[PDB]
Amino acid sequence: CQPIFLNVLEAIEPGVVCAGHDNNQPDSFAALLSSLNELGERQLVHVVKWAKALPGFRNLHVDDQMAVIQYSWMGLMVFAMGWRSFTNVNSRMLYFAPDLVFNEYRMHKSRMYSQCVRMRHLSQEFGWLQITPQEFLCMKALLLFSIIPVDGLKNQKFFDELRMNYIKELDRIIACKRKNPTSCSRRFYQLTKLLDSVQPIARELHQFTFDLLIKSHMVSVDFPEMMAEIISVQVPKILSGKVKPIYFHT
Numbered sequence: 457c458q459p460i461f462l463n464v465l466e467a468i469e470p471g472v473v474c475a476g477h478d479n480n481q482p483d484s485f486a487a488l489l490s491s492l493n494e495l496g497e498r499q500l501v502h503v504v505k506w507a508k509a510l511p512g513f514r515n516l517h518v519d520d521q522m523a524v525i526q527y528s529w530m531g532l533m534v535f536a537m538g539w540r541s542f543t544n545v546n547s548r549m550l551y552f553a554p555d556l557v558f559n560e561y562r563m564h565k566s567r568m569y570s571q572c573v574r575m576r577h578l579s580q581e582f583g584w585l586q587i588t589p590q591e592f593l594c595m596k597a598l599l600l601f602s603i604i605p606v607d608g609l610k611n612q613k614f615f616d617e618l619r620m621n622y623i624k625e626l627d628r629i630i631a632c633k634r635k636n637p638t639s640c641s642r643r644f645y646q647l648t649k650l651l652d653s654v655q656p657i658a659r660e661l662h663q664f665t666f667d668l669l670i671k672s673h674m675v676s677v678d679f680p681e682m683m684a685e686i687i688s689v690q691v692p693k694i695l696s697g698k699v700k701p702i703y704f705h706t
């Protein structure tokens with residue numbers, strides 16, 4: 457008995473985070489998005505402290521730590537939101553936060569229905585593939601190291617090593633159960649397919665939040681500090697092609 461890696465992931469797993477949305481007032485595009493933007497600002501802080509508590513993370517260069525966080529904050533938050541939706545309301549609604557649950561009506565009011573549907577579909581994959589709590593944690597941590605600039609990072613060497621170790625950890629979680637190599641191999645295939653399906657979803661939201669920031673003043677949408685900063689400086693690099701995700705399959 458020495459599941460050191462798994463113990464840490466479960467120990468640093470962020471807690472509940474509210475958005476502070478007023479569910480007593482009628483829904484409106486402006487109010488809904490502004491609340492999500494706030495929820496994002498609040499989440500980002502938790503993610504920063506979460507990633508810094510991850511094994512080996514500290515090895516990365518000070519600038520690369522911030523970089524990976526600023527590039528995958530979108531993918532990480534969605535993957536976690538999809539899980540909450542499955543374990544809380546069985547993927548029937550998007551459980552963004554306790555005080556911010558989106559239904560068929562809100563998905564429409566948000567003016568991003570198509571994107572919400574895709575996130576719900578992702579949430580459903582958790583049930584169709586019978587994803588275990590331990591498998592979820594590993595995959596989420598792996599997402600952090602799933603998007604870097606095509607020109608590599610400051611110390612790209614250390615990054616590949618850390619990623620390799622997290623992938624190795626995913627196999628242990630799979631192997632430490634199955635007996636035959638047919639089940640393990642098959643399982644790895646399924647999980648990798650699940651992780652890649654996240655990238656497409658993330659890119660669609662990256663474009664939506666970017667365009668929204670440009671018209672924010674026009675639609676009366678409030679963008680927090682870091683949120684506006686990261687979206688107008690980091691996000692563009694991804695949409696331009698300077699920063700691309702790391703797919704397992706082609």
Ligand SMILES: C[C@]12CCC(=O)C[C@@H]1CC[C@@H]1[C@@H]2CC[C@]2(C)[C@@H](O)CC[C@@H]12
Nearest residue numbers: 492493495496499533534537552661665
């Ligand atoms: C990451 C958040 C907030 C955290 C969460 O649970 C997932 C969710 C996915 C949609 C994002 C939202 C933050 C604010 C965004 C980026 C809006 O501007 C448009 C898409 C929204």
Ligand SMILES: O=Cc1ccccc1O
Nearest residue numbers: 520523605607608609610
């Ligand atoms: O382009 C390279 C790069 C991008 C983000 C962080 C560190 C880097 O070296």
